[model samples]
Target: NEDLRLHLLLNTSVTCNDGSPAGYYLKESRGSRRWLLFLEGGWYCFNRENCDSRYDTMRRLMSSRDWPRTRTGTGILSSQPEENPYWWNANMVFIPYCSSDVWSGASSKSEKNEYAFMGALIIQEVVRELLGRGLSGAKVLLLAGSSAGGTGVLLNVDRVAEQLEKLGYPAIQVRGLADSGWFLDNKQYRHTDCVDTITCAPTEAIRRGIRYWNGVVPERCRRQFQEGEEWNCFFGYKVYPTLRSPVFVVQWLFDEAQLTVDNVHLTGQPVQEGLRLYIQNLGRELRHTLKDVPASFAPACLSHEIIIRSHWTDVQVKGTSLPRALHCWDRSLHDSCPVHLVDSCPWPHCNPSCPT
Candidate 1:
């Protein structure tokens, strides 16, 4: 543990019996009260042996915008999408079970790939670092990622929710903005050396769309939701309903990877369904739970880019482009500034267009 006031940088990696690469960066800054734990995307953490490249990138991103303090996680690329789509080298799977930085590798889902494990490992490292540094009490956990990183946030929501649950904490002051998360099924629509282009009424239809994007398979889906498969219904399991954290999502109408209105519609279903379930299930368990539940949606400029508000377009915060609009669940105040609910409160949806 180094001095908190000074810009601190330390190495954080853990190895377990499973063989998955895991690590973190202990960054120091000039502020107190709250800290940032950043989750890296799939294309990060190139060097499995060292943290030089990861550190350099983190330093540049944070320093350029004068971001005070932060802790970053490493990303172990499962399979290169751009390099060779037709060639999937399962033999190339890097496993570092010694370090508990991955949440995949189980029999259920993502056994072939460690997507879930990656999400869990990062969260675990971030949590351990925060607790070890005596900064885990009530700090802000900013979850951001691109492409696979975006998917990571959603897949690992359970881990995060559990952390907050133990301390009776309501999913910590968190904010997530995933740009064009490739949530397509891999069986029917698995891309093989081709950029996804899913746009057509026939292709957009529910079952066909999922099949086109995800690809040929009912293997896992058979056991997971085969009881009664719903054609238009996103999934039999409740995803959004269980998410009690305030979140802001951005999806494009025509994502090359997902390509259709059904995907977009599936994106909103959980929000609506989750709100209903939250109100129904735990409405009484934790009175006033759903009163001001937090979540929102909007369209983005690109397919899979994490566009930080306040910094995305022209809405600058301090010197950075990240949005300052804290999700309703994020009680951690930013600079102790009181936000006024003006006619242009920016709630519901606040991107680009503004009134005069």
Candidate 2:
């Protein structure tokens, strides 16, 4: 694997949620015209006190206090052709997880709040700086990330495409592949108010999160919803349809992250009745939401992320691996069939290779 050097946005006012200078990791291929930008995903804090707590544990995510000078890329960002065959020679980037708002925060830090919340600005500034670093001559740019970063791709892909167009690089084919970020805004197995707990429903958590972070949404999507309900744009199912860019959604039918919403502890044993039904329903809801996505890879396995893992090639739907499906989508043409591989089987671990 190749090592990516950390590049800070030194002169920019953008920062992490805690006001630290925001930065990204870059692996520059001297003659490569393709650029792949991967956003790092970490959970967001919904309130100032929550953010204060976040700083204690997820300090590297909330601040750049002790980030490495040089870090090696992996999976999609891997330099090894054996691991990342499609875009190994491309200009690879690893956007570190500093901003806790799923790369969608906009408000500047406040003396009272003591946070910057400039995730969107961080991405914009990075792109602006990259223009001077040879992105101006790019033919293809793929924005891919996992978890919150996956959702970030959904939130920013169209914005990035439009920004490039306005900046006079309309020729670049900007695409996105979101790995395991497609989440269901489902009814909780056991409902609870947005209190001091991780079991808050997606709706309540997001409602509070939007206000706390001063979250930013895509222009087209924002226009689709009423003023007060801008939080709706944060959900993948609600926002994906509004996106004009060709984005491939990769989701696990039984996403483990969704289980955490119900306070379902991680387990190797068969889940209890309530949790089992919820998992099935989550998959059912996922299949229903993703029906019209056009380019998706939904497997029945319970894995959270794939595109950024060494084992990314292992999972498949209908005999096609995630990389294979993505490759087809990347080079998809009017004459070729698009890769939209959703698993036909139901429930978790239905796939033969699913981990026990």
Candidate 3:
């Protein structure tokens, strides 16, 4: 029965739902973690029958040794909950949007739901609110959701970046913690799974098929990609010209929703291939549009299977997208770790600070 709206979730806690949307509660504590906003996966804002489990994970994170003590639903005003507000302390604010409520919609603009636009506005609102209160240097963390939600983050990066720039804060300062959020827009010539796309035994067609689905076989799927305006460049793709902040990417090779395949297919660039293809085809137009912000593209080790554990099991799920933002903080296998989305020649031996 909570009054949940995207605007209220970010700007003021008074109107925020405890993770409920459209009268559902399957997933809770979605917007609780601020650092995880806009993770590749997008925002986990839903309220369904399974919401309690999500809430539990967040609750454990706040009090755990790894994550900093957090104050839930306070709208960045009162600090009487646990600690006092400091001028330079890095504080994060979360905006909740339950997928069950938003994604199930029947509209086009509503495909990613109101949370996408609202998420951008909320970041600005929260920043203005904090600055007004004398907290100028606090970092803004946008913890978001998975797959479909990830699509929103990638699509709306431009708007969000613009808002941040207007506020005199770098967009990179407002990090996006994408979780298993693979939503590539290209239609061909990109592979998500293992490298060495040319050779390889048995051809691993299942893997290849998975890749064909997610990977962009540029020669084949180009028309549909362009006609549908499904490429990454459709929007302002340079919001992360150079990502100054740390971005963690958690992904699984095999996925049920075909998110892995679909996303990789959209980007249309090989994991080993430099972003040249992605840039040339999809994001080329926006290259110079951005102010050269610093960002990185990391790969997730755990398959889609294990990564899902973060949702259901007690196995201390770690996410590269939103590291240290929630109870499960890990950057090892993904981009936060050794493996990177960008392929380095000679295979594993990486160059300096390569996607770390």
- Give the number of the best model, judged by TM-score: 2
Across residues 53-164, which tens digit of lDDT does each residue of candidate 1 receive?
A: 3334443321212333432222211123232221111111111112112122122123453222233544555564455554445445555444434544544544565665
Q: What is the TM-score of each candidate against the true structure?
A: 0.43, 0.95, 0.37
Name model 3 segments beyond 4 Å from true.
Answer: 1-90, 98-127, 130-135, 139-145, 170-172, 184-246, 259-356
Q: Which regions of candidate 1 are displaced past 4 Å? A: 1-20, 43-119, 164-177, 182-238, 259-294, 308-311, 315-356
Greater-TM-score candidate between 1 and 2: 2
**Model 3: ten consecutive residues of lowest lDDT:** 19-28
The candidate, 1 or 2, that scores higher on lDDT is 2
Worst 10 residues of 2 by lDDT: 329-338
lDDT (tens digit, per residue) of candidate 2 on 1-356: 36999988876578876667899888899789889999888667887777788888779988886899989888888889888877788898888878888888877777887787878888888888888888998988889889889999999999899999999998788888898778777787777766643677877778888888888999889999999898888789999988988899988888777777655666678678877777777788889898898899888877677787887777768878778887888767423244888886887778886644
lDDT of 2 at 344: 66
123-186 per-residue lDDT for model 3 (tens digits): 3344455444333433344434355444344434444556657767652344443443442333
Q: What's the distance in Å from true for residue 245, model 1? A: 2.3
Clash count, predicted structure 1: 34
